[PDB]
Amino acid sequence: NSIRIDGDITLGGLFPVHGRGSEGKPCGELKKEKGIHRLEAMLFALDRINNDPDLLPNITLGARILDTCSRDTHALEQSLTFVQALERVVGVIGASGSSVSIMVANILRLFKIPQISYASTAPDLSDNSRYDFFSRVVPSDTYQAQAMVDIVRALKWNYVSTVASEGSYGESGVEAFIQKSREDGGVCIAQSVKIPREPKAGEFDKIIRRLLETSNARAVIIFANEDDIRRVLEAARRANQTGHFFWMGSDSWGSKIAPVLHLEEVAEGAVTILPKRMSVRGFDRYFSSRTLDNNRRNIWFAEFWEDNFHCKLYEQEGKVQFVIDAVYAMGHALHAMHRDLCPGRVGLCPRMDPVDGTQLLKYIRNVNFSGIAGNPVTFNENGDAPGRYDIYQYQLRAEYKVIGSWTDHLHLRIERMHWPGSGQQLPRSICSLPCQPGERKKTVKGMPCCWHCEPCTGYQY
Amino acid sequence: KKVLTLEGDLVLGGLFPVHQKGGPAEDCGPVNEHRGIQRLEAMLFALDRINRDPHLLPGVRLGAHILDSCSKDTHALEQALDFVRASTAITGVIGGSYSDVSIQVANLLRLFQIPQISYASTSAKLSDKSRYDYFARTVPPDFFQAKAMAEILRFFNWTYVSTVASEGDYGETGIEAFELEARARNICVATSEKVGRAMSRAAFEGVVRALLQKPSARVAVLFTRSEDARELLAASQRLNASFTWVASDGWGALESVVAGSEGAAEGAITIELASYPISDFASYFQSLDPWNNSRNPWFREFWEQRFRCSFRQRDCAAHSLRAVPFEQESKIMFVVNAVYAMAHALHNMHRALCPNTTRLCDAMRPVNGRRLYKDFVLNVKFDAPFRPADTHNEVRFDRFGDGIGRYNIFTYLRAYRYQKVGYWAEGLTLDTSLIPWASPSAGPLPASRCSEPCLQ
């Protein structure tokens, strides 16, 4: 059921507050930090943008918030309510799931409903020939793949394994990673494995077995949703691999607490890359001081109370600052359109009743409002945010920490306690060690990043 | 722009690639001769025969609402919105042709439980009934073509092979399934190139250079691109580089891709669905008169294209489809069967809850899609229309809305025409004596291995 916040001009959201079901179940369990924090983030951004008279004077933004269940088909079926009128929705805050965002932009384009999506970093949405009405407040995953290849070069690792979830995040992020490895990336793919959308019979244990077959490929660079992270790390724990692999987490891993809660033994040293973030103090105070389960404006709030305390009726998530950035972007765009179509008329002027995606798309694209925490918010021609990233490591003694920053500069800090939890001085994956005495050809195979050492024995030295 | 709408009375919508995919502009291209107009006229002929049939829906006349997809999924969705704008109520949408268009339209239609019988959607991704619970299919999945293709590459000992795909479902799933099979049969995939949905002309020559980077892999297996009939038309390049192409369902028994480009020389191996030409449709199509055929809007543009005369001017109506030669498109059957299947489903429903009268009693007309598909369309079982007298072929559906796997293997041949080499039906059979490669007369049988065999 939707939240259905009444307003003069009503927005929409595609927040995945519930996780994916199994064995044909329509929906799964609440994702807590991943979903609720984002949903409430918007429900705070809108509230504050309705309280502030400096933006949209006497105009209140509505919200038909609906769960996408992190499932693509259910997301489409729930998003159908936005365009049920062939009460109009002005803009849809797209879903974190990249495939969900892809399909919802494939459908909302037909009805000219603009989208500003937090997360959903898949590069396939960059094609304006198919997703012109789609836009992003986060950097694309192409820059993330390039940053990962750079980070791998800076760590001087080689012969990396990679694991990708089926869909448009994993397969289309790992493909860009493999391409930018071949493109003078100095790194060669050891083994690529695809986690299916519906893992069965403990598939993650055979994922771990496969990855251990290339035992030398100790660096596992991973493009999978947090459920797949949770299960692949639990499977690695079950195989007594703790301290063996070094994980490199894409932004699906980020600094989320669910991939690492009660699982710190294997996740230690897991270097991760996230878009540059600041902890938004206002939302933290609003959510902390909330006398929650007492004021019940939204629906799914009771499930959060029941699951966060295991009874019958913290740190904020990474993306929420992009959620509120997206909402603020929407609002600001609408404000500009108003000031360009009916200046001086406070309230909902008649021109804002038939709001159309075609005109609002330009104002969405060129909007600039310096963000909630001073990060500039702007969109290029394709509607993507500028590529800047923070580089994290999971260092114990929930204890993530900054170790560098990547924006075209590879600004790492190795002395910033960068050791991946074992040994000393950044232990390395490498396919074949150097052979100083000298080798008849140090013969490389067809993959150029690794060699067989045949020594200069005998008179051939 | 134009839409083909016949009379009412429970119309069946249809998606056909009547026009070619256009360039960078927001417009369609030329008229697709074989893969396009012929399938549309076949479904129209099937509807006419069904209406004429005294047994199939005697009291119900089947209309049509035919749309043009232009081989673009985006335009396909923008057009197929007319199907859901009814909630005249379209009973079901037949077709989708290219599997990405079919996937997009099925995703749109599952919100309105519109049954979709596709005549050419082959990609294995449409086999998942969790996402496509209202999808039926008269063709086998492409997984089986990855079987046949592997068998072929194992018969000529082609251990080294290069894969070319296109972005979208067909290419992705085809190369994934063939790579799985190749690893299952010790066959090594040298390289895996992909072409984007509308990638440039020069980048196709770049992809051919990448293919040539591995000189050992003389055999370059082709996964249809979007459709070899018009995308490999831009990638069968004759920059003095030759191969032994092995080609999927997008290449076979049509000259649209091989015209003017003999770089894909005689002997290129293609796989097409196993089918027979229906006899009466040849007469129907050849006898068809452009000024009498006021039904089809695109037919007049097709006859402006085939014969360069514009019907707005003279030098037209002098030629005819009887004088010029006619070859029936391979999938024409897979179209007509689909239409008949839907008709029979409707007839079964009329036998079920409307037996007391000739036509609909107005309670079924808001046709419930879910019961229709699950109980009637999925349970159709009848022999194919207009079979050759010998065969007993029938067009029942699988447990998950798919057909039976049977393929014919062709090779391009000079004195220039295609030629059926053999067939795959749960086992490969090649009568190699029928192709120039057996009894090697141009050097030995073409070889593709990573390294040469060595002595004791």
One-letter amino acid of A44: F
Distant-in-sequence, close-in-space partners of A142: CB < 8 Å, separation ≥ 6: A123, A126, A176
A73 inside 8 A of chain B by CB: yes
Cβ atoms of residues B423 and B432 within 8 Å? no
Distant-in-sequence, close-in-space partners of A54: CB < 8 Å, separation ≥ 6: none
Instruction: State the Cα–Cα distance between residues A295 and A282, nearest whole angstrom.
Output: 19
Q: Token digits for B280?
A: 């009466």
Instruction: State the Cα–Cα distance between residues A361 and A133, nearest whole angstrom.
Output: 7
For residue A221, report the phi and psi dihedrals to the nearest 5 degrees.
Answer: -100, 120
Q: Closest approach of chain B CAs to the CA of A110, in angstroms?
A: 6
Q: How far, in Å, are A125, A136, A354, A382, A442 from residue B14 at the CA level?
A: 29, 36, 33, 34, 62
Q: How many helices (H) and strands (E) does chain A have?
A: 12, 11
Q: Token digits for B284?
A: 């129907």
Question: What is the β-pairing status of strands A271-275 and A219-223?
Answer: unpaired
Instruction: State the Cα–Cα distance between residues B131 and B114, nearest whole angstrom.
Output: 14
Torsion angle of the four alpha carbons A122, A124, A126, A127, in this order, in degrees rounded to the nearest 10: -170
Question: What is the β-pairing status of strands B269-273 and A271-275?
Answer: unpaired
Interchain pair B104, A106: CB under 8 A = yes
Q: What is the resolution of this structure in A?
A: 3.7
B396 is in an annotated binding site: no
B420 is in an annotated binding site: no
Instruction: State the Cα–Cα distance between residues B301 and B112, nearest whole angstrom.
Output: 33
> Which residue in chain A has the smallest CA separation from B198?
A129
Q: Breaks in chain B at C–N > 2.5 Å: after which residues? A: 87, 415
Instruction: State the Cα–Cα distance between residues B70 and B62, nearest whole angstrom.
Output: 25
B200 inside 8 A of chain A by CB: no
Choose among A72, A77, A110: nearest Cβ to B111: A77
3-state secondary structure of A26: coil
Query: Which chain B residues touch A130 with a CB distance below 8 Å?
Result: 73-74
How far is it between the farthest Cα atoms of chain B? 82
Instruction: State the Cα–Cα distance between residues B116 and B114, nearest whole angstrom.
Output: 6
For residue A324, report the phi and psi dihedrals to the nearest 5 degrees.
Answer: -65, -35
How far is it between the farthest Cα atoms of chain A? 94
One-letter amino acid of A123: P
**Residue located via tokens 């660096």:** A219
Interchain pair A110, B111: CB under 8 A = no
Choose among A77, A80, A110: nearest Cβ to B78: A110
Interchain pair A86, B85: CB under 8 A = yes
Distant-in-sequence, close-in-space partners of B141: CB < 8 Å, separation ≥ 6: B122, B123, B124, B126, B127, B402, B405
Interchain pair B81, A110: CB under 8 A = yes
CA-CA-CA-CA torsion sign (B414, B415, B417, B422):
negative
Instruction: State the Cα–Cα distance between residues A300 and A16, nearest whole angstrom.
Output: 12
Cβ atoms of residues B401 and B378 within 8 Å? yes
DSSP state letter for B384: P
Instruction: State the Cα–Cα distance between residues A214 and A431, nearest whole angstrom.
Output: 9
Residue B118, phi-psi category: left (phi > 0), alpha (psi -120 to 50), beta (remainder): beta
One-letter amino acid of A55: L
Cβ atoms of residues A246 and A155 within 8 Å? no
The CA R_g of chain B, rounded to the nearest whole Å, is 22
Cβ atoms of residues B207 and B191 within 8 Å? no
Helix (H) or strand (E) holding B271: strand B269-273
| Nearest CA-CA partner of A87 in A5, A12, A2, A9 | A9
Torsion angle of the four alpha carbons B35, B37, B43, B48, in this order, in degrees rounded to the nearest 10: -160
B70 inside 8 A of chain A by CB: no
Determine the angle formed by the axes of helices B73-84 and B99-109, rounding to 10 degrees: 30
Give the bridge partners for B423, in sequence order: B408, B429
**Residue located via tokens 């959308």:** A197
B104 inside 8 A of chain A by CB: yes
CB count within 10 Å of CB B444 equals 7
Q: Token digits for B435?
A: 């192709």
Instruction: State the Cα–Cα distance between residues A22 and A28, nearest whole angstrom.
Output: 7
**Residue located via tokens 């097709």:** B302
> Which residue in chain A has the smallest CA separation from B130?
A24
User: Based on the number of CB atoms within 10 Å of its own CB, is A407 exposed (0-12), middle (13-18) or buried (19 or more)?
Assistant: middle
Helices (H), B267-387: 279-286, 298-306, 332-353, 369-371
Q: State the count of interchain CB pairs (< 8 A) between A and B.
A: 30
B331 is in an annotated binding site: yes
Q: Which of B73, B78, B81 to mutate to test the interface with A (most CBs of A within 10 A)?
A: B81
Choose among A80, A106, A129: nearest Cβ to B77: A106
Interchain pair B74, A109: CB under 8 A = yes
Instruction: State the Cα–Cα distance between residues A390 and A375, nearest whole angstrom.
Output: 13
Query: Which chain B residues touch A129 with a CB distance below 8 Å?
Result: 74, 197-198
3-state secondary structure of A131: coil
Strands of the sheet containing A271-275, edge to edge, are A189-195, A160-165, A219-223, A246-249, A271-275, A389-394, A400-406, A411-412
> Which residue in chain B has the smallest CA separation from A172?
B167
Q: Closest approach of chain A CAs to the CA of B47, in angstroms?
A: 31
Interchain pair A129, B74: CB under 8 A = yes
Interchain pair A130, B74: CB under 8 A = yes
3-state secondary structure of B323: coil
Helix (H) or strand (E) holding A91: strand A89-93
